[PDB]
Amino acid sequence: KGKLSLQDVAELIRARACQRVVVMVGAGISTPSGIPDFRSPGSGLYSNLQQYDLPYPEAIFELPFFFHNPKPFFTLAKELYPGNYKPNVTHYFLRLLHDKGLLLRLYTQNIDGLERVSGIPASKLVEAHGTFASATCTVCQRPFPGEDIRADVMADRVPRCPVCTGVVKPDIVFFGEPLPQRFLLHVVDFPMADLLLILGTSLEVEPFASLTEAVRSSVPRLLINRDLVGPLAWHPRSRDVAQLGDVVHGVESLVELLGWTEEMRDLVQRETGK
Numbered sequence: 001k002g003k004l005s006l007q008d009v010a011e012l013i014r015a016r017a018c019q020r021v022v023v024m025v026g027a028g029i030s031t032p033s034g035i036p037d038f039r040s041p042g043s044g045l046y047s048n049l050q051q052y053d054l055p056y057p058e059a060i061f062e063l064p065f066f067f068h069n070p071k072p073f074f075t076l077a078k079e080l081y082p083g084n085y086k087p088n089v090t091h092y093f094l095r096l097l098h099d100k101g102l103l104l105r106l107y108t109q110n111i112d113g114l115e116r117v118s119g120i121p122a123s124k125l126v127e128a129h130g131t132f133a134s135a136t137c138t139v140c141q142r143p144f145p146g147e148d149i150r151a152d153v154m155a156d157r158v159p160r161c162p163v164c165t166g167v168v169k170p171d172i173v174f175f176g177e178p179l180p181q182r183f184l185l186h187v188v189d190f191p192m193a194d195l196l197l198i199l200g201t202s203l204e205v206e207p208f209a210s211l212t213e214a215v216r217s218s219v220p221r222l223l224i225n226r227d228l229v230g231p232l233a234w235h236p237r238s239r240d241v242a243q244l245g246d247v248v249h250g251v252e253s254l255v256e257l258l259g260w261t262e263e264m265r266d267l268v269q270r271e272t273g274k
């Protein structure tokens, strides 16, 4: 009756009364891995134009600039490719969610690929701005596993298509391109969620803002974020919970209440040594 607590949410999960969890994540879950929000003054990608050799921030994700000069994007790709950054506690909690059979889907706006890296299968992921895990020839649409262009990427060579010699581009969604097809999984995923989890994003921008409303009235929505802002603050529901502040502290708090602290350490353990 009245406000749910974080404890109540944990008890719902402990009781497997919630076992079809839909997760939405953004830039705020990966800052502890060493990746700042691209918009952060000083340390963000968009304020480091010089280092990438960029004329203006958005050019790195523009098709006509990329055709003119693919090297700045490939510098980012070399940095973001799997094996450079480490997933953190927040990623491993989502992994444990999966391992216990509770994760329906993880929707990510990130391109660091750290969800994949943490061991969550691709079928469980909706990578809404694309991924470095695959690549597509810009000329003939031939697909490549990301591992196929890795040597070229590491050696600062622009990878080329064996069929048409066109430039092969990692499957990152560029400006004006369509969202990936897998995003339409949202039509079935959201009516079916029995719990909505939102980590390190405020979900302020469409099309993600509207998804927060797409879960049923009775579904609890748990925000773990530095602040209560965005759609969840704009339109509170009786079963909403906010755990504000540091996301890693928020997650560790929930892990504690769930009784998973040790399983979490055993996981964060073997995985960090890989």
Ligand SMILES: CS(=O)(=O)NCCC1CCN(c2ncnc3cc(C(N)=O)sc23)CC1
Pocket (backbone or CB within 6 Å): 027, 030, 031, 035, 036, 037, 038, 039, 061, 109, 110, 111, 112, 113, 129, 172, 173, 174, 175, 176
């Ligand atoms: C907006 S778009 O579809 O046309 N271009 C796709 C590229 C976007 C990817 C999502 N965006 C971000 N924005 C700010 N910070 C971050 C940190 C990220 C990470 N840790 O992977 S992704 C990210 C915006 C660009």
Ligand code: NA
Pocket (backbone or CB within 6 Å): 068, 069
């Ligand atoms: Na040039």
Ligand SMILES: [Zn+2]
Pocket (backbone or CB within 6 Å): 137, 138, 139, 140, 141, 142, 161, 162, 163, 164, 165, 166
């Ligand atoms: Zn080709």
